[PDB]
Every structure is written in structure tokens, then in C-alpha cells.
Design an enzyme around this catalytic site. Structure first.
Site, PDB file in Angstrom:
ATOM      1  N   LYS A  41       1.362  -0.710   0.247  1.00 49.97           N
ATOM      2  CA  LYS A  41       0.135  -0.016  -0.353  1.00 49.97           C
ATOM      3  C   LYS A  41       1.039   1.333   0.088  1.00 49.97           C
ATOM      4  O   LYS A  41       0.126   2.300  -0.430  1.00 49.97           O
ATOM      5  CB  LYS A  41      -0.854   0.216   1.245  1.00 49.97           C
ATOM      6  N   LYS A  57      -6.692  -8.925  -5.346  1.00 52.16           N
ATOM      7  CA  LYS A  57      -7.916  -8.958  -4.386  1.00 52.16           C
ATOM      8  C   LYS A  57      -8.788  -8.529  -4.705  1.00 52.16           C
ATOM      9  O   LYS A  57      -8.472  -7.402  -4.970  1.00 52.16           O
ATOM     10  CB  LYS A  57      -7.322  -9.052  -2.925  1.00 52.16           C
ATOM     11  N   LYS A  74     -12.452  -3.519  -1.666  1.00 55.16           N
ATOM     12  CA  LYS A  74     -13.555  -1.749  -1.335  1.00 55.16           C
ATOM     13  C   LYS A  74     -12.618  -1.200  -1.728  1.00 55.16           C
ATOM     14  O   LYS A  74     -13.939   0.476  -2.268  1.00 55.16           O
ATOM     15  CB  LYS A  74     -14.739  -2.021  -0.483  1.00 55.16           C
TER      16      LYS A  74
HETATM   17  N1  LIG Z   1     -10.907 -10.009  -1.509  1.00 51.84           N
HETATM   18  C1  LIG Z   1     -11.505 -10.827  -0.382  1.00 51.84           C
HETATM   19  N2  LIG Z   1     -12.225 -12.185  -0.319  1.00 51.84           N
HETATM   20  C2  LIG Z   1     -12.316 -12.253   0.907  1.00 51.84           C
HETATM   21  N3  LIG Z   1     -12.347 -11.506   2.324  1.00 51.84           N
HETATM   22  C3  LIG Z   1     -11.283  -9.780   2.900  1.00 51.84           C
HETATM   23  C4  LIG Z   1     -11.491  -9.554   0.280  1.00 51.84           C
HETATM   24  N4  LIG Z   1     -10.838  -7.849   1.091  1.00 51.84           N
HETATM   25  C5  LIG Z   1     -11.274  -8.727   2.723  1.00 51.84           C
HETATM   26  N5  LIG Z   1     -11.243  -8.780   3.514  1.00 51.84           N
HETATM   27  C6  LIG Z   1     -11.746  -9.593   4.139  1.00 51.84           C
HETATM   28  O1  LIG Z   1     -12.780  -8.790   4.484  1.00 51.84           O
HETATM   29  C7  LIG Z   1     -12.150  -7.580   5.878  1.00 51.84           C
HETATM   30  C8  LIG Z   1     -12.300  -6.227   6.472  1.00 51.84           C
HETATM   31  O2  LIG Z   1     -11.567  -5.854   5.473  1.00 51.84           O
HETATM   32  P1  LIG Z   1     -11.426  -4.182   4.755  1.00 51.84           P
HETATM   33  O3  LIG Z   1     -12.633  -3.817   5.432  1.00 51.84           O
HETATM   34  O4  LIG Z   1      -9.803  -4.277   4.942  1.00 51.84           O
HETATM   35  O5  LIG Z   1     -11.865  -4.555   3.496  1.00 51.84           O
HETATM   36  P2  LIG Z   1     -10.855  -4.273   1.920  1.00 51.84           P
HETATM   37  O6  LIG Z   1     -11.993  -4.537   0.691  1.00 51.84           O
HETATM   38  O7  LIG Z   1      -9.527  -5.078   1.914  1.00 51.84           O
HETATM   39  O8  LIG Z   1     -11.117  -2.849   2.314  1.00 51.84           O
HETATM   40  P3  LIG Z   1     -10.137  -1.963   1.784  1.00 51.84           P
HETATM   41  O9  LIG Z   1      -9.900  -1.358  -0.183  1.00 51.84           O
HETATM   42  O10 LIG Z   1     -10.337  -0.550   2.157  1.00 51.84           O
HETATM   43  O11 LIG Z   1      -9.027  -2.345   2.177  1.00 51.84           O
HETATM   44  C9  LIG Z   1     -11.002  -8.308   6.366  1.00 51.84           C
HETATM   45  O12 LIG Z   1     -11.474 -10.053   7.000  1.00 51.84           O
HETATM   46  C10 LIG Z   1     -11.471  -9.274   5.315  1.00 51.84           C
HETATM   47  O13 LIG Z   1      -9.612  -9.646   5.330  1.00 51.84           O
HETATM   48 MG   LIG Z   2      -8.153  -4.211   3.895  1.00 52.55          MG
END
Ligand SMILES: Nc1ncnc2c1ncn2[C@@H]1O[C@H](COP(=O)(O)OP(=O)(O)OP(=O)(O)O)[C@@H](O)[C@H]1O
Ligand SMILES: [Mg+2]
Ligand SMILES: Nc1ncnc2c1ncn2[C@@H]1O[C@H](COP(=O)(O)OP(=O)(O)OP(=O)(O)O)[C@@H](O)[C@H]1O
Ligand SMILES: CNC1=NC(=O)[C@H]([C@H](C)c2c[nH]c3ccccc23)O1
Ligand SMILES: CNC1=NC(=O)[C@H]([C@H](C)c2c[nH]c3ccccc23)O1
Ligand SMILES: [Mg+2]
Lengths: 328, 328
Positions: free
Chosen positions: A112, A193, A196
Site C-alpha cells: 500500500k 484481491k 472495496k
Molecule cells: N477479496 C477478499 N476476499 C475475502 N475476504 C476479504 C477480501 N477483501 C477483504 N476481505 C476481508 O474482509 C475484511 C474487512 O477488510 P477491509 O475492511 O479492509 O475490506 P477491504 O475490501 O480490504 O477494504 P480496503 O480496500 O479499504 O482495504 C477482512 O476480514 C478481510 O480479510
Molecule cells: Mg483491507
């Protein structure tokens, strides 16, 4: 007594089907078998820029979606991180325990931050905040996606370090990463991956995307030119990811789907998957709109923060006592 | 209304004549002209290892010494940092504002980390905690020694960044560094400042040192072989530092002392200085023992934390509102 679960999701955007499959979907199951804390971690979200209006909005949307997917506020504690000061208090103490080298070597930081321009200190130091999130509630089990595995390992190290330096206080938590769907991939780059906060909205499907939008995003999902629907993560990462999503959301096994689409093209496969996703999200979105319209959403979060403060503030007292902070 | 002062001292040991001359002595004057907050910053102290028993003890000793030197708890707010959660809350928000590069370039970090072995993250990230300490109370003036100048400059940058990114909230504070005594030097190494956490106790005189001990430490203070008592910071840093201490504690000017000791040796000069220090500390130590024996010490800190929490928690609410954290 019951073992304890803690998990957090950032209000850095609207949660995705990746967030759902990887974490949130399992929260709904776990709430009946464990003592559960599910957190809207807004202090984690601001480790990068968030528009204040959007952040406020996303905090409420995440709360509504937690409830919309079926988390029962009488079976689990739902709360906003910043409404419990103990998280920032414990984060500071754990920052004094962790070594700079440990933070710098974290895979997620090095990723990041590559491209740096300027990097907030929070982006480097959020892991001890995450460790505080977990350790404050004497957590046994931490349900997360694959990308948080190293963070849980650091949390375990910090807990042990504190325990041996000052005295046994913390439970050593264990990660629970689902066997399937622990890393849903981006629709536009199947080697990353789904996230969001991706600058490209086509990379993800949010739980609030409408039918037209989901159809578009699945249609434009990157695939190979081979034209055959079968699972091969190395040679066909795009189609493999779509198969994985189809499978976990429909209940059909990958092997079953391969047969169902034998002699079929990507066009009909994608059109079908879109509708599977749409039908999945339909009842979620209906319940979501209910919660966004009510004062009861705020009352749930009020009560959750009340509960979380009672537990976490007591743990902070014990941590301070162990380190010698404050007064007897 | 009155302008506002904030300053903090770490319970990382017993405060020194350096701490006294550079900061604490002026607190006693300023309390009558300003709205004053004087803080025992125990969360700063744990950025390096503190024995828990010693830390608890040093927190109380510092409080007692604050009062012993003449700080009036009805004219100034005396409190312990960790008893006001807002400092950790605001520290986290400011950590998300500061850039890693800014922290790494800090002179005090690069010095306290050289030799690294392992460095706590807290040692890197305490400046935003310091910025929170200051900014929480709409502070106008920050009385400190020379070594904290760069930290105040960073605090001003962070305040401005927040103000322009989100909206005008913070007062931009200004350092007040005394014209004399802003950097008392170590007795054993006149090119380093006196520090209460020096591993060599001979480097400093604490406000609690007894007469024998002060005599020993002044006697062993490093000097040149020239045998002449005159001020020359470059050629005679040891004797110059001793002259500076003699001067600020006795009221005599350096020029006057040079004349008084014309044709005299370092032996009698050091013997005299020891007694000047001893007579200075005598009434302080008497009042100190009074406060260490009473419940009134705790009552003062209780009331101070009560006051500080009311002011700081309101500022945290405003910061959160500006960034979009939590709920309306
Ligand atoms: N592609 C994915 N597949 C499965 N689990 C995910 C994925 N992305 C995030 N998670 C899970 O969902 C959770 C919440 O993480 P987070 O709020 O950081 O979401 P994010 O999509 O990574 O958002 P950001 O892009 O802001 O990091 C964590 O438990 C993480 O392991
Ligand atoms: Mg994340
Ligand atoms: N040698 C000195 N001369 C004048 N002021 C000093 C000196 N050392 C510290 N100060 C001042 O006293 C204050 C309290 O600082 P602090 O609690 O860090 O003391 P310290 O002696 O530097 O302890 P440590 O060795 O733990 O850093 C600050 O305002 C600082 O500028
Ligand atoms: C940028 N911060 C961050 N990214 C993550 O994936 C973690 C998650 C969201 C997290 C913070 N605290 C937690 C406690 C339990 C499980 C996950 C998290 O934090
Ligand atoms: C290691 N932390 C630290 N060293 C310092 O000299 C500063 C001081 C003690 C400090 C912390 N917060 C403050 C607020 C106003 C004035 C000085 C300080 O902090
Ligand atoms: Mg210092």
C-alpha cells in the site's frame, strides 16, 4: 463459558461480495455459537484519505448491512470503534511494544506504500491498533480473509511479548480463515484481491450495486480467449475466480458448474452469474433500506458501544496496571 | 480571555536541575498570567522500557515535585496524561495526518534510535502524541527547552494541515524557549544535554539528590586542565555549563562570577557550586516530602484530570466531526 469472536470491517467504502464471502457471511453463522463482537472500524479507515461526508455515510451503511445480512443485535455486539476510547488507548500501549522493523516488513504496508508520494504514519502503525481491537475482548477466534493472516500472527507475537514482559494478561487469539472464498479476486485484475477501496469501481461488486450495474461489471470481468469454462487458477485466473463466486453463492460445486457449462460460452456463463449475484443481494438490499430509514439503527449502535466500553475499559485498566501507567 | 499554556514532563525518572531550569521553574511564574495545563506525560515515558514499579513511583514523585516547586493547583491544572483518554484518541487521528517521512527526519528520533538493536514504534510516533497533548487545549504558548523546538514546529505543521484539509479548528501554538538555561549540559559529557534517563547517574543532578551526592557529582564534573574560570562554550564547555548553572541558580551574572573567581581554582569553584545547588533544593525537598505523605496529592490529580477531560473530550468530538468519524 463460550469462546469469544472479534472481527472488524472498515467503512472505507461499501462492502463487497469479497467482504461478504470472506468474512461477513460467516459472522451470521458464528453469532449463535460464540460470544461475538463485530466492529465498524472507522479509525482504521482514516489511515488513508476519506471524505468526511462519505465516511459518515459509509459508517451507517456498514452498520445497516451488518444487520441486513442477519446479524442479531441480541446475539452479537455491534459497535463503532471510535465510540470506544479503549481501542486508541490500547493501540498506543501496543505501539510501545511492537518494533519498527516488524511494522516495516508487513506485506500489506510494503504494498500500500509502494508508489509512496507521502504515506501517513497510520498506514504503518494500524497493525497494533488491530491488535488492540482483538486483544481488548479476550478474543479466542478472529474470522478474517487470507490477507489479514500476517496481521493476526503479529497480534499473537505482541500478546506474548506483553505477557512475558509484564505478566499473563492476554488470550493468544487464533485466525479462522474460511476454506473457500478467503480471497475473492478483482474482476478487472484477477491477480489482485477484490478491495472495496479500489479506484476502479469495475474491480468489485458492492452489496448495494443495482442489477444493471452488476450485469455490466460481470460482463466486463477479465477472462482469457480460450472460451472454455473450467477451473485453472494459473492459466485461467479470471474464469476461475468467477467460478469460485458462482459456486459459493449458488451452492453448486465448481465441478458441477464445469459440467453444467460444458460446450457453453463465457457470454451465457457471465449472464447467468450476474443473475445469481443479483438474486443473492435482493433480500439483503430490502432489509438494508429498512435499517437506513429507522432510529433503531442508532439505538443498536448505542447499546453495542455501551457493552464494548464496559469490557474494553476494564482491560485497559489491567494493561495500565501491568505497565505501571497512571495510579493504583 | 487569557492565553493558554500547556507543557509536559515525562515520569521517566526523577526530574533534573536541567528540567527545572529549562522548564519547570518558569511554570511557577506563568501560572499567574495564563490559563495553564501542566502534564505528567506517562504515555510518553513508555516509548522506552520503564520498570512498572519505578514508573508508578516516578509519576507520584513528579506530581509532588510540581507542587513542591510552587505550582498552585487552583491556578493551574495538574494531571496525568493517561487519565485523559482524549490524548490517545487525538494522537491516533494526528498519526493519520503526519507523514512517515516527517517522523523519520526528526533529529531526536535519529539520535535515540542510532544503535538501534530494536526500536519501539512509539519512539518514532510520539511526536503526534505530543501534538495532541498541545492542540487538545487550544494552546497558545508551549514553554519548553531547546531540544523540543523541532517538535513544536511539527505540531504547528500538523495543526495547519488539519485546518486546511478539514476546516479551521486548531490554534497554531508557539514555543517559548527561555533565553538562558534552555539546554543545561551533562556533567560527564558537556557536549550532550542533561537527560533524566541518562544511564550514568553522574550526568545529572535530580531535585531529590542529597547533599553528599550533589557534592560528589559536581566534583566529578568534567572540566579542562586550563585552571581558569571563564565562559567559553567552545573551548571550555564543562566550566561554561557549570558557570551557567551557578548563574541561573544564584542570580549572579556569568560576568560577575568570573570576577568573583579570578585567581581561584576549580576545586573551590565546584565546592561552592555544590552548596548553591544544595541550598536551592533544600526547601523544594521539604515540601516534596510533605506531598508524598498525603492523600491530598491524589485529590489534586483527581480534580485536574476531571478538568482536563472536560476540555479535551470536547475537542476530540470536534476533531471527529471534522474528519467524519463516528456519528452526528
Ligand atoms: N477479496 C477478499 N476476499 C475475502 N475476504 C476479504 C477480501 N477483501 C477483504 N476481505 C476481508 O474482509 C475484511 C474487512 O477488510 P477491509 O475492511 O479492509 O475490506 P477491504 O475490501 O480490504 O477494504 P480496503 O480496500 O479499504 O482495504 C477482512 O476480514 C478481510 O480479510
Ligand atoms: Mg483491507
Ligand atoms: N538539559 C535540559 N535543559 C533544559 N531543559 C530541558 C533539558 N532536558 C529536558 N528539558 C526540558 O524539560 C522538559 C521535559 O522533558 P523530558 O521529560 O523529556 O526530560 P528529559 O530529561 O529529556 O528526560 P528523558 O531523558 O527521559 O528524555 C522539556 O520541556 C525539555 O525541553
Ligand atoms: C487498514 N486497517 C485494516 N485493514 C484490515 O483488513 C484490518 C481489518 C479491517 C481489522 C481491523 N481490526 C480488526 C479486528 C479483527 C478482525 C479484522 C480487523 O484493519
Ligand atoms: C519521549 N516523549 C517526549 N519527550 C519530550 O521532551 C516531549 C515532552 C516531554 C512533551 C510531551 N508532550 C508535551 C506537551 C507540551 C510540552 C512538552 C511535551 O515528549
Ligand atoms: Mg527528553
Amino acid at each position: 463459558g463460550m469462546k469469544t469472536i472479534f472481527s472488524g470491517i472498515q467503512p472505507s467504502g461499501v462492502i463487497t461480495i469479497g467482504n461478504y464471502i470472506g468474512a461477513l457471511r460467516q459472522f451470521v453463522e458464528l453469532q449463535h455459537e460464540y460470544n461475538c463482537y463485530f466492529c465498524i472500524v472507522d479509525q482504521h479507515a482514516i489511515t488513508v484519505w476519506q471524505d468526511p461526508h462519505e465516511l459518515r455515510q459509509n459508517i451507517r451503511r456498514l452498520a445497516a448491512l451488518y444487520l441486513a445480512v442477519g446479524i442479531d443485535p441480541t446475539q452479537a455486539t455491534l459497535f463503532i470503534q471510535s465510540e470506544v476510547p479503549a481501542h486508541a488507548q490500547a493501540a498506543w500501549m501496543l505501539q510501545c511494544i511492537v518494533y519498527i522493523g516488524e511494522l516495516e516488513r508487513m506485506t500489506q504496508f510494503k504494498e500500500k506504500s509502494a508508489g509512496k508520494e507521502a504515506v501517513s504514519a497510520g498506514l504503518l502503525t494500524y497493525p497494533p491498533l488491530m491488535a488492540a481491537d482483538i486483544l481488548l475482548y479476550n478474543t479466542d477466534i478472529v474470522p478474517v480473509g487470507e490477507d489479514q493472516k500476517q496481521h493476526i500472527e503479529l497480534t499473537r507475537d505482541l500478546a506474548e511479548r506483553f505477557n512475558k514482559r509484564y505478566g499473563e494478561l492476554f488470550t493468544i487469539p487464533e485466525a479462522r480463515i474460511p476454506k473457500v472464498g478467503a480471497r475473492i479476486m478483482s474482476l478487472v485484475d484477477p491477480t489482485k484481491k477484490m478491495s472495496k477501496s479500489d479506484p476502479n469501481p469495475k474491480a468489485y461488486i458492492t452489496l448495494l450495486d443495482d442489477a444493471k450495474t452488476i450485469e455490466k461489471k460481470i460482463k466486463s470481468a477479465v477472462t482469457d480467449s480460450e472460451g472454455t469454462i473450467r477451473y485453472d487458477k494459473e492459466a485461467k485466473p479470471g474464469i476461475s475466480n468467477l467460478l469460485n463466486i458462482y459456486s459459493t453463492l449458488s451452492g453448486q460445486s465448481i465441478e458441477e458448474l464445469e459440467r453444467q457449462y460444458e460446450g457453453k460460452g463465457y457470454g451465457v456463463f457471465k449472464a447467468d452469474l450476474a443473475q445469481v449475484v443479483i438474486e443473492t443481494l435482493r433480500p439483503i438490499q430490502e432489509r438494508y433500506h429498512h435499517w437506513m430509514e429507522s432510529e433503531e439503527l442508532d439505538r443498536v449502535l448505542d447499546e453495542g458501544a455501551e457493552k464494548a466500553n464496559r469490557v474494553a475499559s476494564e482491560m485497559v485498566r489491567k494493561m495500565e496496571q501491568a505497565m505501571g501507567l497512571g495510579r493504583r
